[PDB]
Amino acid sequence: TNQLQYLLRVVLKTLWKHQFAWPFQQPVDAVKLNLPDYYKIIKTPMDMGTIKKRLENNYYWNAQECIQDFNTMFTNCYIYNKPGDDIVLMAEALEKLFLQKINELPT
Ligand SMILES: CCc1nc(COC)c(-c2cc3c(=O)n(C)cc(-c4cc(C(C)(C)O)ccc4Oc4c(C)cc(F)cc4C)c3o2)[nH]1
């Protein structure tokens, strides 16, 4: 019933497994991909890699701080990219699944 435990062992596990996870398993390396304007446009970057770490290393005060970061990851992608881009359809897919798993969240 500890919610952070649930986010790690169940929510993050399911999303990490998913077909479309791989572009979100690590920070967007703006240099390698030649994105000069990314860290200017996106104020608080986020990826499942960093969320994973933060859950493992007892960083989050509570589950709501963690769920905020997941949402930042999605909105970040929807901000920087054009709608109907492939990257977006992938984040949208992940988000749907994320919100299903958050509804079975133990109280
Ligand atoms: C190369 C210039 C560029 N255009 C875009 C948007 O088009 C999909 C991006 C872009 C945006 C964007 C993004 O928002 N996220 C979260 C992740 C990527 C991305 C990241 C990486 C790595 C693993 C190196 O970090 C690899 C591929 C990424 O995006 C894709 C994807 C997902 C599919 C593609 F066909 C081509 C790219 C560039 C990523 O790439 N970059």
PDB file of all heavy atoms in Angstrom, residues 3 11-12 14 17-20 35 38 41 43 47-49 68-69 72-73 78 82 88 90-91 93 99 103 106-107, unseen atoms left out:
ATOM      1  N   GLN A   3       2.863   3.921  -1.634  1.00  0.00           N
ATOM      2  CA  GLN A   3       2.526   4.343  -3.016  1.00  0.00           C
ATOM      3  C   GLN A   3       3.812   4.424  -3.847  1.00  0.00           C
ATOM      4  O   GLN A   3       3.791   3.975  -5.008  1.00  0.00           O
ATOM      5  CB  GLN A   3       1.761   5.668  -2.971  1.00  0.00           C
ATOM      6  CG  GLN A   3       0.503   5.618  -2.115  1.00  0.00           C
ATOM      7  CD  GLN A   3      -0.457   6.737  -2.440  1.00  0.00           C
ATOM      8  OE1 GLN A   3      -0.112   7.916  -2.387  1.00  0.00           O
ATOM      9  NE2 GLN A   3      -1.684   6.374  -2.778  1.00  0.00           N
ATOM     10  N   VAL A  11       4.174   0.479 -11.556  1.00  0.00           N
ATOM     11  CA  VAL A  11       3.910   1.534 -12.582  1.00  0.00           C
ATOM     12  C   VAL A  11       5.124   1.640 -13.508  1.00  0.00           C
ATOM     13  O   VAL A  11       4.954   1.449 -14.739  1.00  0.00           O
ATOM     14  CB  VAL A  11       3.573   2.897 -11.955  1.00  0.00           C
ATOM     15  CG1 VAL A  11       3.347   3.968 -13.018  1.00  0.00           C
ATOM     16  CG2 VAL A  11       2.374   2.793 -11.024  1.00  0.00           C
ATOM     17  N   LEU A  12       6.294   1.939 -12.933  1.00  0.00           N
ATOM     18  CA  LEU A  12       7.569   2.141 -13.673  1.00  0.00           C
ATOM     19  C   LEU A  12       7.966   0.835 -14.362  1.00  0.00           C
ATOM     20  O   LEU A  12       8.414   0.910 -15.524  1.00  0.00           O
ATOM     21  CB  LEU A  12       8.668   2.610 -12.718  1.00  0.00           C
ATOM     22  CG  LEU A  12      10.022   2.915 -13.356  1.00  0.00           C
ATOM     23  CD1 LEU A  12       9.886   3.894 -14.510  1.00  0.00           C
ATOM     24  CD2 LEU A  12      10.978   3.474 -12.323  1.00  0.00           C
ATOM     25  N   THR A  14       5.988  -1.516 -15.614  1.00  0.00           N
ATOM     26  CA  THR A  14       5.085  -1.707 -16.783  1.00  0.00           C
ATOM     27  C   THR A  14       5.487  -0.774 -17.922  1.00  0.00           C
ATOM     28  O   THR A  14       5.486  -1.240 -19.073  1.00  0.00           O
ATOM     29  CB  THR A  14       3.617  -1.428 -16.450  1.00  0.00           C
ATOM     30  OG1 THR A  14       3.392  -1.839 -15.104  1.00  0.00           O
ATOM     31  CG2 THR A  14       2.666  -2.139 -17.391  1.00  0.00           C
ATOM     32  N   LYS A  17       9.019  -1.696 -19.591  1.00  0.00           N
ATOM     33  CA  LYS A  17       8.789  -2.899 -20.446  1.00  0.00           C
ATOM     34  C   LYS A  17       8.262  -2.490 -21.825  1.00  0.00           C
ATOM     35  O   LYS A  17       8.591  -3.173 -22.807  1.00  0.00           O
ATOM     36  CB  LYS A  17       7.728  -3.823 -19.834  1.00  0.00           C
ATOM     37  CG  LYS A  17       8.184  -4.732 -18.698  1.00  0.00           C
ATOM     38  CD  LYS A  17       8.711  -6.085 -19.161  1.00  0.00           C
ATOM     39  CE  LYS A  17       8.425  -7.219 -18.195  1.00  0.00           C
ATOM     40  NZ  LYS A  17       9.101  -7.017 -16.892  1.00  0.00           N
ATOM     41  N   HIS A  18       7.443  -1.439 -21.873  1.00  0.00           N
ATOM     42  CA  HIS A  18       6.581  -1.082 -23.026  1.00  0.00           C
ATOM     43  C   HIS A  18       7.422  -0.850 -24.285  1.00  0.00           C
ATOM     44  O   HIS A  18       8.577  -0.401 -24.165  1.00  0.00           O
ATOM     45  CB  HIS A  18       5.719   0.138 -22.695  1.00  0.00           C
ATOM     46  CG  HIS A  18       4.683   0.416 -23.729  1.00  0.00           C
ATOM     47  ND1 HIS A  18       4.997   0.943 -24.967  1.00  0.00           N
ATOM     48  CD2 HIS A  18       3.345   0.233 -23.725  1.00  0.00           C
ATOM     49  CE1 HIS A  18       3.900   1.072 -25.680  1.00  0.00           C
ATOM     50  NE2 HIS A  18       2.870   0.650 -24.938  1.00  0.00           N
ATOM     51  N   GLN A  19       6.813  -1.128 -25.442  1.00  0.00           N
ATOM     52  CA  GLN A  19       7.416  -1.102 -26.802  1.00  0.00           C
ATOM     53  C   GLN A  19       8.040   0.271 -27.077  1.00  0.00           C
ATOM     54  O   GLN A  19       9.099   0.318 -27.740  1.00  0.00           O
ATOM     55  CB  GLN A  19       6.333  -1.448 -27.833  1.00  0.00           C
ATOM     56  CG  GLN A  19       6.812  -2.362 -28.959  1.00  0.00           C
ATOM     57  CD  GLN A  19       6.999  -1.664 -30.286  1.00  0.00           C
ATOM     58  OE1 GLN A  19       6.136  -0.922 -30.752  1.00  0.00           O
ATOM     59  NE2 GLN A  19       8.124  -1.933 -30.931  1.00  0.00           N
ATOM     60  N   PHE A  20       7.410   1.340 -26.579  1.00  0.00           N
ATOM     61  CA  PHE A  20       7.717   2.753 -26.920  1.00  0.00           C
ATOM     62  C   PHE A  20       8.525   3.442 -25.812  1.00  0.00           C
ATOM     63  O   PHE A  20       8.685   4.670 -25.878  1.00  0.00           O
ATOM     64  CB  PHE A  20       6.422   3.530 -27.158  1.00  0.00           C
ATOM     65  CG  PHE A  20       5.597   3.079 -28.335  1.00  0.00           C
ATOM     66  CD1 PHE A  20       4.214   3.033 -28.248  1.00  0.00           C
ATOM     67  CD2 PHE A  20       6.191   2.746 -29.542  1.00  0.00           C
ATOM     68  CE1 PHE A  20       3.447   2.632 -29.328  1.00  0.00           C
ATOM     69  CE2 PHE A  20       5.422   2.350 -30.625  1.00  0.00           C
ATOM     70  CZ  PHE A  20       4.053   2.297 -30.517  1.00  0.00           C
ATOM     71  N   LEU A  35      20.079  19.455 -31.059  1.00  0.00           N
ATOM     72  CA  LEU A  35      18.929  20.253 -30.561  1.00  0.00           C
ATOM     73  C   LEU A  35      19.474  21.409 -29.730  1.00  0.00           C
ATOM     74  O   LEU A  35      19.632  21.299 -28.515  1.00  0.00           O
ATOM     75  CB  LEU A  35      18.018  19.357 -29.719  1.00  0.00           C
ATOM     76  CG  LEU A  35      17.467  18.120 -30.426  1.00  0.00           C
ATOM     77  CD1 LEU A  35      16.570  17.321 -29.490  1.00  0.00           C
ATOM     78  CD2 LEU A  35      16.718  18.509 -31.687  1.00  0.00           C
ATOM     79  N   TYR A  38      16.512  23.044 -27.201  1.00  0.00           N
ATOM     80  CA  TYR A  38      15.769  22.122 -26.300  1.00  0.00           C
ATOM     81  C   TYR A  38      15.828  22.599 -24.846  1.00  0.00           C
ATOM     82  O   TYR A  38      14.767  22.798 -24.244  1.00  0.00           O
ATOM     83  CB  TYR A  38      16.310  20.693 -26.353  1.00  0.00           C
ATOM     84  CG  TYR A  38      15.399  19.704 -25.673  1.00  0.00           C
ATOM     85  CD1 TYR A  38      14.302  19.181 -26.345  1.00  0.00           C
ATOM     86  CD2 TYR A  38      15.606  19.317 -24.356  1.00  0.00           C
ATOM     87  CE1 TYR A  38      13.445  18.280 -25.735  1.00  0.00           C
ATOM     88  CE2 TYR A  38      14.753  18.420 -23.730  1.00  0.00           C
ATOM     89  CZ  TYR A  38      13.666  17.903 -24.421  1.00  0.00           C
ATOM     90  OH  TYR A  38      12.801  17.030 -23.826  1.00  0.00           O
ATOM     91  N   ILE A  41      13.825  25.835 -24.360  1.00  0.00           N
ATOM     92  CA  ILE A  41      12.341  25.647 -24.401  1.00  0.00           C
ATOM     93  C   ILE A  41      11.854  24.831 -23.194  1.00  0.00           C
ATOM     94  O   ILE A  41      10.806  25.191 -22.641  1.00  0.00           O
ATOM     95  CB  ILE A  41      11.904  24.990 -25.724  1.00  0.00           C
ATOM     96  CG1 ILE A  41      11.972  25.992 -26.880  1.00  0.00           C
ATOM     97  CG2 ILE A  41      10.523  24.363 -25.587  1.00  0.00           C
ATOM     98  CD1 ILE A  41      11.617  25.416 -28.235  1.00  0.00           C
ATOM     99  N   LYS A  43      12.072  23.636 -19.478  1.00  0.00           N
ATOM    100  CA  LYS A  43      12.680  24.237 -18.264  1.00  0.00           C
ATOM    101  C   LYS A  43      13.073  23.143 -17.261  1.00  0.00           C
ATOM    102  O   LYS A  43      14.164  23.266 -16.694  1.00  0.00           O
ATOM    103  CB  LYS A  43      11.740  25.292 -17.675  1.00  0.00           C
ATOM    104  CG  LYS A  43      11.450  26.484 -18.584  1.00  0.00           C
ATOM    105  CD  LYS A  43      12.685  27.107 -19.228  1.00  0.00           C
ATOM    106  CE  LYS A  43      12.608  28.615 -19.360  1.00  0.00           C
ATOM    107  NZ  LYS A  43      11.398  29.051 -20.098  1.00  0.00           N
ATOM    108  N   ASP A  47      12.751  12.119 -17.668  1.00  0.00           N
ATOM    109  CA  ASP A  47      12.842  10.804 -18.338  1.00  0.00           C
ATOM    110  C   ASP A  47      12.663   9.735 -17.264  1.00  0.00           C
ATOM    111  O   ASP A  47      12.955  10.023 -16.076  1.00  0.00           O
ATOM    112  CB  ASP A  47      14.195  10.634 -19.019  1.00  0.00           C
ATOM    113  CG  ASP A  47      15.335  10.775 -18.029  1.00  0.00           C
ATOM    114  OD1 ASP A  47      15.670  11.934 -17.684  1.00  0.00           O
ATOM    115  OD2 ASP A  47      15.837   9.726 -17.569  1.00  0.00           O
ATOM    116  N   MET A  48      12.219   8.550 -17.675  1.00  0.00           N
ATOM    117  CA  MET A  48      11.942   7.424 -16.756  1.00  0.00           C
ATOM    118  C   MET A  48      13.248   6.995 -16.076  1.00  0.00           C
ATOM    119  O   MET A  48      13.176   6.523 -14.929  1.00  0.00           O
ATOM    120  CB  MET A  48      11.298   6.261 -17.510  1.00  0.00           C
ATOM    121  CG  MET A  48       9.848   6.529 -17.844  1.00  0.00           C
ATOM    122  SD  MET A  48       9.048   5.069 -18.522  1.00  0.00           S
ATOM    123  CE  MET A  48       9.885   4.942 -20.099  1.00  0.00           C
ATOM    124  N   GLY A  49      14.391   7.185 -16.742  1.00  0.00           N
ATOM    125  CA  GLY A  49      15.724   6.944 -16.158  1.00  0.00           C
ATOM    126  C   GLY A  49      15.904   7.693 -14.848  1.00  0.00           C
ATOM    127  O   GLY A  49      16.249   7.066 -13.838  1.00  0.00           O
ATOM    128  N   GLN A  68       3.983  13.874 -10.574  1.00  0.00           N
ATOM    129  CA  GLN A  68       4.237  15.188 -11.215  1.00  0.00           C
ATOM    130  C   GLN A  68       5.321  15.026 -12.287  1.00  0.00           C
ATOM    131  O   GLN A  68       5.137  15.558 -13.399  1.00  0.00           O
ATOM    132  CB  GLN A  68       4.665  16.215 -10.169  1.00  0.00           C
ATOM    133  CG  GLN A  68       4.205  17.628 -10.488  1.00  0.00           C
ATOM    134  CD  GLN A  68       4.431  18.560  -9.323  1.00  0.00           C
ATOM    135  OE1 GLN A  68       4.799  19.720  -9.492  1.00  0.00           O
ATOM    136  NE2 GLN A  68       4.219  18.054  -8.118  1.00  0.00           N
ATOM    137  N   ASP A  69       6.397  14.300 -11.965  1.00  0.00           N
ATOM    138  CA  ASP A  69       7.580  14.118 -12.851  1.00  0.00           C
ATOM    139  C   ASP A  69       7.184  13.317 -14.091  1.00  0.00           C
ATOM    140  O   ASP A  69       7.549  13.757 -15.204  1.00  0.00           O
ATOM    141  CB  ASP A  69       8.758  13.468 -12.123  1.00  0.00           C
ATOM    142  CG  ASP A  69       9.591  14.432 -11.288  1.00  0.00           C
ATOM    143  OD1 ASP A  69       9.376  15.675 -11.393  1.00  0.00           O
ATOM    144  OD2 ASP A  69      10.456  13.933 -10.543  1.00  0.00           O
ATOM    145  N   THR A  72       5.346  15.678 -16.261  1.00  0.00           N
ATOM    146  CA  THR A  72       6.339  16.606 -16.863  1.00  0.00           C
ATOM    147  C   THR A  72       6.971  15.951 -18.098  1.00  0.00           C
ATOM    148  O   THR A  72       7.121  16.637 -19.125  1.00  0.00           O
ATOM    149  CB  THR A  72       7.420  17.022 -15.866  1.00  0.00           C
ATOM    150  OG1 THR A  72       6.786  17.542 -14.698  1.00  0.00           O
ATOM    151  CG2 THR A  72       8.348  18.064 -16.443  1.00  0.00           C
ATOM    152  N   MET A  73       7.320  14.670 -18.007  1.00  0.00           N
ATOM    153  CA  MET A  73       7.975  13.942 -19.120  1.00  0.00           C
ATOM    154  C   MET A  73       7.084  14.017 -20.361  1.00  0.00           C
ATOM    155  O   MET A  73       7.593  14.370 -21.455  1.00  0.00           O
ATOM    156  CB  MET A  73       8.199  12.479 -18.751  1.00  0.00           C
ATOM    157  CG  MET A  73       8.938  11.688 -19.799  1.00  0.00           C
ATOM    158  SD  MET A  73       9.160  10.017 -19.183  1.00  0.00           S
ATOM    159  CE  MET A  73       7.468   9.428 -19.236  1.00  0.00           C
ATOM    160  N   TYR A  78       5.215  16.868 -25.583  1.00  0.00           N
ATOM    161  CA  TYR A  78       4.083  17.494 -26.319  1.00  0.00           C
ATOM    162  C   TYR A  78       4.387  18.969 -26.599  1.00  0.00           C
ATOM    163  O   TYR A  78       3.868  19.513 -27.591  1.00  0.00           O
ATOM    164  CB  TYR A  78       2.757  17.389 -25.559  1.00  0.00           C
ATOM    165  CG  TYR A  78       2.340  15.992 -25.180  1.00  0.00           C
ATOM    166  CD1 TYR A  78       1.680  15.755 -23.986  1.00  0.00           C
ATOM    167  CD2 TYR A  78       2.584  14.911 -26.011  1.00  0.00           C
ATOM    168  CE1 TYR A  78       1.288  14.480 -23.618  1.00  0.00           C
ATOM    169  CE2 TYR A  78       2.201  13.628 -25.658  1.00  0.00           C
ATOM    170  CZ  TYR A  78       1.550  13.411 -24.456  1.00  0.00           C
ATOM    171  OH  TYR A  78       1.171  12.155 -24.085  1.00  0.00           O
ATOM    172  N   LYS A  82       5.944  18.576 -32.579  1.00  0.00           N
ATOM    173  CA  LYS A  82       4.684  18.900 -33.309  1.00  0.00           C
ATOM    174  C   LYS A  82       3.704  17.759 -33.058  1.00  0.00           C
ATOM    175  O   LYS A  82       4.128  16.624 -32.872  1.00  0.00           O
ATOM    176  CB  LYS A  82       4.940  19.095 -34.811  1.00  0.00           C
ATOM    177  CG  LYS A  82       6.105  20.010 -35.180  1.00  0.00           C
ATOM    178  N   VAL A  88       5.567  11.743 -30.338  1.00  0.00           N
ATOM    179  CA  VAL A  88       4.357  12.173 -29.578  1.00  0.00           C
ATOM    180  C   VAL A  88       3.391  10.995 -29.427  1.00  0.00           C
ATOM    181  O   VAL A  88       2.975  10.731 -28.291  1.00  0.00           O
ATOM    182  CB  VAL A  88       3.683  13.387 -30.238  1.00  0.00           C
ATOM    183  CG1 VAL A  88       2.244  13.567 -29.772  1.00  0.00           C
ATOM    184  CG2 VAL A  88       4.504  14.648 -30.000  1.00  0.00           C
ATOM    185  N   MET A  90       4.021   7.999 -29.387  1.00  0.00           N
ATOM    186  CA  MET A  90       4.705   7.098 -28.421  1.00  0.00           C
ATOM    187  C   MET A  90       4.426   7.569 -26.985  1.00  0.00           C
ATOM    188  O   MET A  90       4.049   6.731 -26.135  1.00  0.00           O
ATOM    189  CB  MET A  90       6.216   7.068 -28.682  1.00  0.00           C
ATOM    190  CG  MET A  90       6.603   6.346 -29.963  1.00  0.00           C
ATOM    191  SD  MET A  90       8.350   6.558 -30.433  1.00  0.00           S
ATOM    192  CE  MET A  90       9.074   5.086 -29.717  1.00  0.00           C
ATOM    193  N   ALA A  91       4.620   8.856 -26.704  1.00  0.00           N
ATOM    194  CA  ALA A  91       4.411   9.426 -25.354  1.00  0.00           C
ATOM    195  C   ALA A  91       2.936   9.273 -24.997  1.00  0.00           C
ATOM    196  O   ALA A  91       2.651   8.915 -23.845  1.00  0.00           O
ATOM    197  CB  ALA A  91       4.843  10.869 -25.294  1.00  0.00           C
ATOM    198  N   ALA A  93       0.782   7.039 -26.088  1.00  0.00           N
ATOM    199  CA  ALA A  93       0.608   5.598 -25.804  1.00  0.00           C
ATOM    200  C   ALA A  93       0.999   5.335 -24.352  1.00  0.00           C
ATOM    201  O   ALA A  93       0.173   4.769 -23.608  1.00  0.00           O
ATOM    202  CB  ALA A  93       1.447   4.777 -26.747  1.00  0.00           C
ATOM    203  N   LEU A  99      -1.774   6.314 -16.814  1.00  0.00           N
ATOM    204  CA  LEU A  99      -2.987   6.805 -16.106  1.00  0.00           C
ATOM    205  C   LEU A  99      -3.886   5.625 -15.706  1.00  0.00           C
ATOM    206  O   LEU A  99      -4.545   5.737 -14.649  1.00  0.00           O
ATOM    207  CB  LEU A  99      -3.728   7.816 -16.988  1.00  0.00           C
ATOM    208  CG  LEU A  99      -3.063   9.188 -17.108  1.00  0.00           C
ATOM    209  CD1 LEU A  99      -3.702  10.021 -18.213  1.00  0.00           C
ATOM    210  CD2 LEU A  99      -3.106   9.939 -15.784  1.00  0.00           C
ATOM    211  N   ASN A 103      -4.658   4.523 -11.481  1.00  0.00           N
ATOM    212  CA  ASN A 103      -6.061   4.421 -10.979  1.00  0.00           C
ATOM    213  C   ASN A 103      -6.196   3.234 -10.021  1.00  0.00           C
ATOM    214  O   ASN A 103      -7.086   3.287  -9.154  1.00  0.00           O
ATOM    215  CB  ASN A 103      -7.094   4.312 -12.105  1.00  0.00           C
ATOM    216  CG  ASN A 103      -7.701   5.651 -12.468  1.00  0.00           C
ATOM    217  OD1 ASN A 103      -6.983   6.626 -12.691  1.00  0.00           O
ATOM    218  ND2 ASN A 103      -9.021   5.709 -12.523  1.00  0.00           N
ATOM    219  N   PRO A 106      -2.862   1.944  -4.641  1.00  0.00           N
ATOM    220  CA  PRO A 106      -3.295   1.706  -3.262  1.00  0.00           C
ATOM    221  C   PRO A 106      -3.420   2.988  -2.418  1.00  0.00           C
ATOM    222  O   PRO A 106      -2.558   3.842  -2.530  1.00  0.00           O
ATOM    223  CB  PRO A 106      -2.182   0.813  -2.687  1.00  0.00           C
ATOM    224  CG  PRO A 106      -1.586   0.121  -3.892  1.00  0.00           C
ATOM    225  CD  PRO A 106      -1.682   1.143  -5.003  1.00  0.00           C
ATOM    226  N   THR A 107      -4.438   3.076  -1.578  1.00  0.00           N
ATOM    227  CA  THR A 107      -4.591   4.231  -0.716  1.00  0.00           C
ATOM    228  C   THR A 107      -3.884   3.958   0.597  1.00  0.00           C
ATOM    229  O   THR A 107      -3.786   2.810   1.025  1.00  0.00           O
ATOM    230  CB  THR A 107      -6.072   4.506  -0.450  1.00  0.00           C
ATOM    231  OG1 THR A 107      -6.705   3.299  -0.011  1.00  0.00           O
ATOM    232  CG2 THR A 107      -6.752   4.990  -1.719  1.00  0.00           C
TER     233      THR A 107
END
